[PDB]
Amino acid sequence: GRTPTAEERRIANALGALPCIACYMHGVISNEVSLHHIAGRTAPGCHKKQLPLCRWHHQHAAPAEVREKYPWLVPVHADGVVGGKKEFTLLNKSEMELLADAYEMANIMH
Numbered sequence: 001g002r003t004p005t006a007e008e009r010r011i012a013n014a015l016g017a018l019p020c021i022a023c024y025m026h027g028v029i030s031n032e033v034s035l036h037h038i039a040g041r042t043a044p045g046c047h048k049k050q051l052p053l054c055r056w057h058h059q060h061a062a063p064a065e066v067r068e069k070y071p072w073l074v075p076v077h078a079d080g081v082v083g084g085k086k087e088f089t090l091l092n093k094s095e096m097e098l099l100a101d102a103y104e105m106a107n108i109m110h
Ligand SMILES: [Zn+2]
Pocket: 020, 021, 022, 023, 024, 030, 053, 054, 055, 056, 057
């Protein structure tokens, strides 16, 4: 995609220092995260629109027995038939609502 601007780098770096924003709404502190693009990798400002997510909320489906205890622990990118944007939203919040939560936590004006 498009290389980030300096302002995008500053924002992304702030977001990337947060624990998983989806786990956080469930009271769980998951601090090993990667950034997830909500709105692609090319449009202006797209790199400001990223969520810090744990491995299980980003790309990996946890074992079913684990999801029985943590049913909201589903990846925003489907892994087989587990997760995807719609199921992730159902069990958490929309991506843009989580982005607002992340901005609040990182003390970024929004
Ligand atoms: Zn998580």
